[PDB]
Amino acid sequence: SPLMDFFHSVEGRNYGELRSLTNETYQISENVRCTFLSIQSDPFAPGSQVRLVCPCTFSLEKVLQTTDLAAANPCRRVAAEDFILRSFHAGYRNGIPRRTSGAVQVLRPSQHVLERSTVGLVKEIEIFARVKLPGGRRIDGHGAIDIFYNELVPLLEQCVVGLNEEDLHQHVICVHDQEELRSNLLGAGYVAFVANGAILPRDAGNSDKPLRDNAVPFQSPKSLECSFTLPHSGKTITGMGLPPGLTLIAGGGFHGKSTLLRALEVGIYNHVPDDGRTYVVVDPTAVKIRAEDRRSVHGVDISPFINNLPFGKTTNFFVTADASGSTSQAANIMEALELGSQLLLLDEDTCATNLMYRDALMQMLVPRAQEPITPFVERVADLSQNHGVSSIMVIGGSGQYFPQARVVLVMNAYQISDCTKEAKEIASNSSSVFIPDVNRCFDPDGSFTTVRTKVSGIGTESIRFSEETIDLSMVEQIVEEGQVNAIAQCLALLYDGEPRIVPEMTTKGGALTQLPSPGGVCFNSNFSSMIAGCCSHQHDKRLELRTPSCYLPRGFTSATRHIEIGAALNRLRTLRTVT
Amino acid sequence: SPLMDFFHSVEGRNYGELRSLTNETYQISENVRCTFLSIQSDPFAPGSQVRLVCPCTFSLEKVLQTTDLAAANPCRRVAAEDFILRSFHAGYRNGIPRRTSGAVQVLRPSQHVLERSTVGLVKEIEIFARVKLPGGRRIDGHGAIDIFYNELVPLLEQCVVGLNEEDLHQHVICVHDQEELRSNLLGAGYVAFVANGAILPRDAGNSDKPLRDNAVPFQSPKSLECSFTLPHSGKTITGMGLPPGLTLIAGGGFHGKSTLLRALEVGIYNHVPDDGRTYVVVDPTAVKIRAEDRRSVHGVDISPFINNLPFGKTTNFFVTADASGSTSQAANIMEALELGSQLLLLDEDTCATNLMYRDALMQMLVPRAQEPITPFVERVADLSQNHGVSSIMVIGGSGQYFPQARVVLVMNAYQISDCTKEAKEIASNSSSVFIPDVNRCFDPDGSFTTVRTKVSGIGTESIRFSEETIDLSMVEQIVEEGQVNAIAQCLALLYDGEPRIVPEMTTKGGALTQLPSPGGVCFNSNFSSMIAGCCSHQHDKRLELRTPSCYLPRGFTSATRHIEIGAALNRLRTLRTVT
Ligand SMILES: Nc1ncnc2c1ncn2[C@@H]1O[C@H](COP(=O)(O)OP(=O)(O)O)[C@@H](O)[C@H]1O
Ligand SMILES: Nc1ncnc2c1ncn2[C@@H]1O[C@H](COP(=O)(O)OP(=O)(O)O)[C@@H](O)[C@H]1O
Ligand SMILES: [Hg+2]
Ligand SMILES: [Hg+2]
Ligand SMILES: [Hg+2]
Ligand SMILES: [Hg+2]
Ligand SMILES: [Hg+2]
Ligand SMILES: [Hg+2]
Ligand SMILES: [Hg+2]
Ligand SMILES: [Hg+2]
Ligand SMILES: [Hg+2]
Ligand SMILES: [Hg+2]
Ligand SMILES: [Hg+2]
Ligand SMILES: [Hg+2]
Ligand SMILES: [Hg+2]
Ligand SMILES: [Hg+2]
Ligand SMILES: [Hg+2]
Ligand SMILES: [Hg+2]
Ligand SMILES: [Mg+2]
Ligand SMILES: [Mg+2]
Structure with missing residues (x-):
């Protein structure tokens, strides 16, 4: 109720009035609460970050095998999170929303089951989205009330709280056997x-x-x-x-x-x-x-x-x-x-x-x-x-x-x-003719001297690094925008902690025996060990890296191999390497 | 003076107040007048279309050879227009503007000399641009006064009215001899x-x-x-x-x-x-x-x-x-x-x-x-x-x-x-084994039945045709965004005059002996003859096609061969062909 009451009482007032939302939580349904994380400056801009949370209605026992989430197989947890995301989206194709605005932006998955920051099974199901708050330059109370009450609430109540426990459980099984087979x-x-x-x-x-x-x-x-x-x-x-x-x-x-x-x-x-x-x-x-x-x-x-x-x-x-x-x-x-x-x-x-x-x-x-x-x-x-x-x-x-x-x-x-x-x-x-022991230090000094920043992923095709375009159109195993969003993030972190992070990552990587795979299960050089550190750390940090150079919203990131991370950096045109 | 006076008297008033500009002309200098063609709805949106006009200060005799423009060689006229455009842009690199906003959008040429709608030698030099009018949601009078008075006026006065008559004349000569040689x-x-x-x-x-x-x-x-x-x-x-x-x-x-x-x-x-x-x-x-x-x-x-x-x-x-x-x-x-x-x-x-x-x-x-x-x-x-x-x-x-x-x-x-x-x-x-007489009607009926429009060029890489993406990333002789903007336009016209234009174009094309080249100088099928009509007409229409499906501003179009026009349509995934 409250939130609607709110969007009513601001129905005509000035758009800056929305800032009152930030960081607040609203029960818009019995099963669906909604935290705002961020509020847009204008209606035209990239929308407000929102987090919606609803509960497990399925059984952790049947689906995840273990009793409590922490002890569950990360592969099943990831597969489950991938099911819930798919269900959510399917909800649009089946016209579940009473009203469809198009002001909602949630990451769309590929045919592939990847770890993403989008849907989280926490200890309780949370989804991260950008909502373009409707508003001429004053708040649209009813435009907004539709988005939350008659689009999102039912969507989540129905294709998410109301998910098919059997369908989910078979999804998780299929994904798990695939991983078994490959590994x-x-x-x-x-x-x-x-x-x-x-x-x-x-x-x-x-x-x-x-x-x-x-x-x-x-x-x-x-x-x-x-x-x-x-x-x-x-x-x-x-x-x-x-x-x-x-x-x-x-x-x-x-x-x-x-x-x-x-x-x-x-x-x-x-x-x-x-x-x-x-x-x-x-x-x-x-x-x-x-x-x-x-x-x-x-x-x-x-x-x-x-x-x-x-x-x-x-x-x-x-x-x-x-x-x-x-x-x-x-x-x-x-x-x-x-x-x-x-x-x-x-x-x-x-x-x-x-x-x-x-x-x-x-x-x-x-x-x-x-x-x-x-x-x-x-x-x-x-x-x-x-x-x-x-x-x-x-x-x-x-x-x-x-x-x-x-x-x-x-x-x-x-x-x-x-x-x-x-x-x-x-x-x-x-x-x-080949020699496993490759000679290469990434040279952060040489590589970053022209950086005037902003690092952003562009579709599946490129990364914009300051005034540089990293072309990934022919790194062909990149499959989701989120992966590019992933790569664009170590880059920003690699740069933002310029002095201390490169030797840290490079040392971290030399130590490791196992690297995390895109499905979540866990020849050498300074460069590769660094890369192996680039995303051992990014995976521990749960795929998202808040740094001054990164402007990516929550819940738009997907796992990628270290190979693809190195793939992108190898293709940076300012890249300088040494011994 | 007036325009500045204007932007003063609106300095704080509501952004919609700018609409008064539309279709008006303003002498912002002795040599530089400025017509507005369009005014943006909000500051965030794609800018207002503007046309700036200044005069020939060079001699039509030395440069174009003929006395009056109509009688001039289109190749020299095009080369001249290509020089003026380059000069304009170079003006930024040489810091000519007293103030550089970045609110100006003028088409950037390639290494190649093409006919474009951007700069026109008329019977008098006119340039087409989009200016993002500065404005929180009220007019920025001084932000705007800078753009016109201290960026554009000097720019045009200096690198355009003030162009090097000798440099231009040698540009036109080089371009003309190139064309001579190829033809x-x-x-x-x-x-x-x-x-x-x-x-x-x-x-x-x-x-x-x-x-x-x-x-x-x-x-x-x-x-x-x-x-x-x-x-x-x-x-x-x-x-x-x-x-x-x-x-x-x-x-x-x-x-x-x-x-x-x-x-x-x-x-x-x-x-x-x-x-x-x-x-x-x-x-x-x-x-x-x-x-x-x-x-x-x-x-x-x-x-x-x-x-x-x-x-x-x-x-x-x-x-x-x-x-x-x-x-x-x-x-x-x-x-x-x-x-x-x-x-x-x-x-x-x-x-x-x-x-x-x-x-x-x-x-x-x-x-x-x-x-x-x-x-x-x-x-x-x-x-x-x-x-x-x-x-x-x-x-x-x-x-x-x-x-x-x-x-x-x-x-x-x-x-x-x-x-x-x-x-x-x-x-x-x-x-x-080859037979010059190819059997193919474009089938507008079959090709357009799923069209829900908007046709727009996307960089050098693709055309967005309704809910369809035409991929041109491997049509490799496409060299400028303007060419893609060109292709996206017959498409919109091909569609907008759906019934009458296809038989018209196809007939037009069967008749022709000479097709216009990208530099402006002037085996068969129903399809190709149509294509040969697609852009015989577009060239007569001076490269721009105003139709309900096209939302492209003035002065962002570049010439392309009919081959590339056909290239794009061949790659449309809804394309249906017949006999
Ligand atoms: N005439 C030339 N003078 C100087 N450098 C050249 C010349 N031709 C090519 N190059 C450079 O050398 C590289 C090899 O040229 P390329 O034609 O790609 O080799 P390939 O014969 O394998 O096609 C290119 O990256 C180019 O930048
Ligand atoms: N097993 C299959 N069953 C049915 N269609 C197929 C199969 N494999 C490929 N195709 C289709 O036939 C076409 C030819 O396949 P492709 O592998 O590209 O041929 P090539 O052997 O030249 O690589 C493809 O466009 C694909 O859509
Ligand atoms: Hg949920
Ligand atoms: Hg596993
Ligand atoms: Hg399966
Ligand atoms: Hg096997
Ligand atoms: Hg065989
Ligand atoms: Hg090969
Ligand atoms: Hg990783
Ligand atoms: Hg980030
Ligand atoms: Hg001019
Ligand atoms: Hg010519
Ligand atoms: Hg020359
Ligand atoms: Hg020759
Ligand atoms: Hg030889
Ligand atoms: Hg070949
Ligand atoms: Hg043409
Ligand atoms: Hg147009
Ligand atoms: Mg093959
Ligand atoms: Mg070769």
């Missing part, structure tokens, strides 16, 4: 697993939802079939297990190779049970590797792939403002290695192919003396045998990886086939 | 020309300015050297002329191949005289061709490259919501052909390489029966001999195009070399 891949002796009956294709070019119509379910070649009995559902699933080493994915155009590789890329994530890619997992450290022309690089050793540059330019400590296709990809590989990646994913179409192979005709035209590039084909075995680093590759034009392949697959009309033997036969009927 | 390429028997002494490289990965330091000037191989005496400067320049047919650009990594191809891509444009790429020209219809995964296609015949798709899917009238690498590239090629392109530019790194070639080992694994893709290598000669369509290609991995090549170039440390003979030798020491 058992290594032990079981695999590098990837594609579950039979999976629906790999998406519904459109700009969709991440499964194909509705005529999707051809994935079926494992009989020779690669694996089984895993999931602990929580108790169900036993079969699929294709890929062993350590080099896997080739071959086949004609439009036969699904890239569609399969994509599912693999995002196999470091758990999905919504009906995503179609559930139980399609890969090594948690898997990195999509691609050419990235024109990107900048600082202090990366790519001499395993590139030597003898024009004018004797160092590849041992490579530094450009304008990468080519081959040196950007080699830089990506070497940065992936430093950040901990044990599995490389490649797709011929986005590869700098001159990096990949060179036929004999070409070597005649352009002899190795004229050619800085050492092909990947001559290094892939080095990486795998000496360093435990596997590769999966979609290939078209060339078959000269057949010899190195441990698995060669052929795709015909979306069907997978094991053609390893035939591959090897064709190979006969025809015709360490 | 004489065909006649002279070439397809591209790279002027000796050109500075191809850019200064950074995210810059379009020439490299400052240690740039290695382009030098033509002696065997390809051409000369052209420019009519207006009277200067004679030399460089590399590329003949019709297939040119290969080969060479090691980091040797400048992509840097050269890029200069070629944008060689359909005129640049600022000190750009470094001036007199680096190609066929005006040149199109960069690349893979574009996941894009949508409707009604394109790609059967020259793709046949036998899974489940008997038509390639004769190809239609997906999710293109693969090979079918999107083939679709790009076929769309380019339909839109009139006589010159194809390709770069191995962004190619779907399985489209490009397949080695023998691969054909053993995956026989043609399993392979929908017919390689480009088997079609390039068809295109060139039968249809006059040339190709220039950066290639790395494979040398199987050597046989078809008419010119093979090798790049070593940024030096170009003619290795055609040696290429051919290696080729020996080893080992029509």
Whole structure:
């Protein structure tokens, strides 16, 4: 009642009158209370931060297993929080609100189940939102009363207090078994697993939802079939297990190779049970590797792939403002290695192919003396045998990886086939360099000298760091705005505590054995250890970092790997590195 | 005086009081008058549209050649307007304004000289801007008086009335000789020309300015050297002329191949005289061709490259919501052909390489029966001999195009070399399908049925069409926001006059012999003829189209080819096509 009474008594008064709200709590329903955290300056501006809280109506026993929240599996807690968020949003599609304003901004999840600051299960369910308070320049009492009483209150009462305890419990189970399966891949002796009956294709070019119509379910070649009995559902699933080493994915155009590789890329994530890619997992450290022309690089050793540059330019400590296709990809590989990646994913179409192979005709035209590039084909075995680093590759034009392949697959009309033997036969009927101990200090002094601040995430595509744009359009395993919001935050903290935080983070990271994953479960350099500290700390700090440089509201952050954090900083154009 | 007096007498009064401005003209200086066109609703909103006018202080005789503006060469008029705009902006860097607010928004040009609605030479110089009128919710009289009196007035008086008549005249000459050279390429028997002494490289990965330091000037191989005496400067320049047919650009990594191809891509444009790429020209219809995964296609015949798709899917009238690498590239090629392109530019790194070639080992694994893709290598000669369509290609991995090549170039440390003979030798020491008469009606009925409007350009990267995002991030010859603003406008007009405009445009386009180029100088289907009408009309209408669906201010539009207009519509996901 009170809040409505309030919005009544201010119905016409001046907008600044709203400031009285700040920090206050209002029962707008029996089950729904509403704290204001912040109040907007004008109606035009970014809305007031709000926190809404309602209670567990489901049983911590059935759903979380443990009696009290602290003792619960963080993976189930995260999956639950991901369910509640989805329910909330679905509530709009089912027209639950008596009135729909569009003044509410709550983070929208992806197909993936991530830890986010948006929905919290506390010791009691809290949701963080921005509400654009209605108001010509005086308060709209009734505009606002609708938002809270006839949009939010019912929404929460219904799709949240009123959530389906059974639906939730099955959501948590599916998410948990996915995590089980991925975190058992290594032990079981695999590098990837594609579950039979999976629906790999998406519904459109700009969709991440499964194909509705005529999707051809994935079926494992009989020779690669694996089984895993999931602990929580108790169900036993079969699929294709890929062993350590080099896997080739071959086949004609439009036969699904890239569609399969994509599912693999995002196999470091758990999905919504009906995503179609559930139980399609890969090594948690898997990195999509691609050419990235024109990107900048600082202090990366790519001499395993590139030597003898024009004018004797160092590849041992490579530094450009304008990468080519081959040196950007080699830089990506070497940065992936430093950040901990044990599995490389490649797709011929986005590869700098001159990096990949060179036929004999070409070597005649352009002899190795004229050619800085050492092909990947001559290094892939080095990486795998000496360093435990596997590769999966979609290939078209060339078959000269057949010899190195441990698995060669052929795709015909979306069907997978094991053609390893035939591959090897064709190979006969025809015709360490890496060092785990990388040398790199991030140089905060050099990197930050031009900073005039503001650090903000821009969609999924970039970070605005002062007068600098960090381009993430080709860091392709970034999946949610919240992740970018996450990256933009250590950056701001990395900068705001400029002197003490870098040595702190770098020391922190050297110590660690386990890094937190995006689903919440918990080769070296100064740089990577720092990065490993960048977000060990951010995860302890529960994903949000209040610093003078950060202007992000509460509840718009999503977990990301340390690999992606390092990904962003590697691509900062002011970046300076040292020894 | 008056306007200041005005902004004084309203200094504290309510913001709505500003509406009195609208449509009024104010002499804020002897040489500078200022019409308001529009006034913002609130201070927060997008600013008031303003038009400022000052006079020719330079001589139409020396600069434009003709006595009166109407009779002047549109290319010189456009170049002049491009100079004045640049001068205006430079005025900020040289701190000309006594006060710099940041409330002024004028379109910023690129390195390229384009026709724009921003600066107009009329029969008298007019500039179109948005000014964010300062104002808590009441007018800022002094905030505003600064903007006009101490920022704009001096700016225009100084870098515009006070422009360097000699600098301008040399700008116009350079631009005109560039246009002369490109529009004489065909006649002279070439397809591209790279002027000796050109500075191809850019200064950074995210810059379009020439490299400052240690740039290695382009030098033509002696065997390809051409000369052209420019009519207006009277200067004679030399460089590399590329003949019709297939040119290969080969060479090691980091040797400048992509840097050269890029200069070629944008060689359909005129640049600022000190750009470094001036007199680096190609066929005006040149199109960069690349893979574009996941894009949508409707009604394109790609059967020259793709046949036998899974489940008997038509390639004769190809239609997906999710293109693969090979079918999107083939679709790009076929769309380019339909839109009139006589010159194809390709770069191995962004190619779907399985489209490009397949080695023998691969054909053993995956026989043609399993392979929908017919390689480009088997079609390039068809295109060139039968249809006059040339190709220039950066290639790395494979040398199987050597046989078809008419010119093979090798790049070593940024030096170009003619290795055609040696290429051919290696080729020996080893080992029509297109139909000009394309069948396609745009179907306005099918395409527009989901439109709930608003059409707006988003940077250089996309168009927002109702609840649809047209993705242009890989239409790579788009160079200015204004071009996107241009495309977004026929779309809105195409839609707003839904019934009568499509048959009108399509008829208009069938009639035409000459299409206007971005610098202002003036294979078939229903679709392309429509497109050729889309912007014959937009150019007559002087680039701006007032329709209920368009909310773009005056003076933020830039010319684009019809090819790019068609480029955008081909990529609309609701697009429906017919016969
Ligand atoms: N298993 C599948 N079932 C149904 N459709 C699929 C399947 N895999 C891919 N597709 C669809 O067919 C198209 C071709 O797939 P893609 O993997 O891109 O081919 P390529 O082998 O060239 O990578 C895609 O646009 C996708 O939407
Ligand atoms: N003529 C030149 N003079 C000086 N630097 C150049 C020149 N051409 C290219 N570069 C620089 O060297 C790098 C390699 O050029 P690029 O064309 O990308 O190599 P690639 O042959 O692999 O395409 C680019 O980042 C560019 O900035
Ligand atoms: Hg709640
Ligand atoms: Hg877990
Ligand atoms: Hg499941
Ligand atoms: Hg398995
Ligand atoms: Hg590859
Ligand atoms: Hg086989
Ligand atoms: Hg983290
Ligand atoms: Hg923050
Ligand atoms: Hg002027
Ligand atoms: Hg001209
Ligand atoms: Hg010039
Ligand atoms: Hg020439
Ligand atoms: Hg190519
Ligand atoms: Hg040569
Ligand atoms: Hg046009
Ligand atoms: Hg308009
Ligand atoms: Mg492929
Ligand atoms: Mg290249």
